[PDB]
């Protein structure tokens, strides 16, 4: 969020005064950036713990355990389990 533009819409009359509050404009960006930087660290450590990208063999005999729901859908342009797409519907 750009403090200067948010507080003072595109107008120097207000922009001048904002200079008198000092870092309040900037340090917010530092706070927000502080959030948004680590927001990818979250997704970093949660999802990528894996050194290499595995992929299942072409043929599945697991002993009768049918994973074709959870495995990536080869046909969807974005390869995603049949289940995952249910989620992407339910959330907006």
């Amino acid at each position: 969020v750009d403090c200067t533009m948010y507080i003072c819409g595109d107008s120097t009359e207000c922009s001048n005064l904002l200079l008198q509050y000092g870092s309040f404009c900037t340090q917010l960006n530092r706070a927000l950036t502080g959030i948004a930087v680590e927001q990818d660290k979250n997704t970093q450590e949660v999802f990528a713990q894996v050194k290499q990208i595995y992929k299942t063999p072409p043929i599945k005999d697991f002993g009768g355990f049918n994973f074709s729901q959870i495995l990536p859908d080869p046909s969807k342009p974005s390869k995603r389990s049949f289940i995952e797409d249910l989620l992407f519907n339910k959330v907006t």
């Binding site: 750009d2 200067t4 533009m5 595109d10 960006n29 950036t33």
Partner: protein
């Protein structure tokens, strides 16, 4: 080049224009004399700009950096450092302006 203030004087006048001064002389009969030697100099106009000033242990400023010089120079003014670590930094925003 670091320039110390010589004298801070009460002038109180606006100066909008000027010219330099010269030292010439007279010569005597040869095939009056003027324009001793050659003369050339450099002139440039000032302008408000934000510089980051790096003093030395003895206060001798070496590195100065303008913030508005290029989109690269404006980020170094955000980190205040002359060393810029490998990565992405967010320089001041830009706006499209009305025609």
């Amino acid at each position: 080049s670091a320039l110390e203030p010589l004298v801070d004087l009460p002038i109180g006048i606006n100066i909008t224009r000027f010219q330099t001064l010269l030292a010439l002389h007279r010569s005597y009969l040869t095939p009056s004399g003027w324009t001793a030697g050659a003369a050339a100099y450099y002139v440039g106009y000032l302008q408000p700009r934000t510089f980051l000033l790096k003093y030395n242990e003895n206060g001798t400023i070496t590195d100065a950096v303008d913030c508005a010089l290029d989109p690269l120079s404006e980020t170094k003014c955000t980190l205040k450092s002359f060393t810029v670590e490998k990565g992405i930094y967010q320089t001041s925003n830009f706006r499209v302006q009305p025609t």
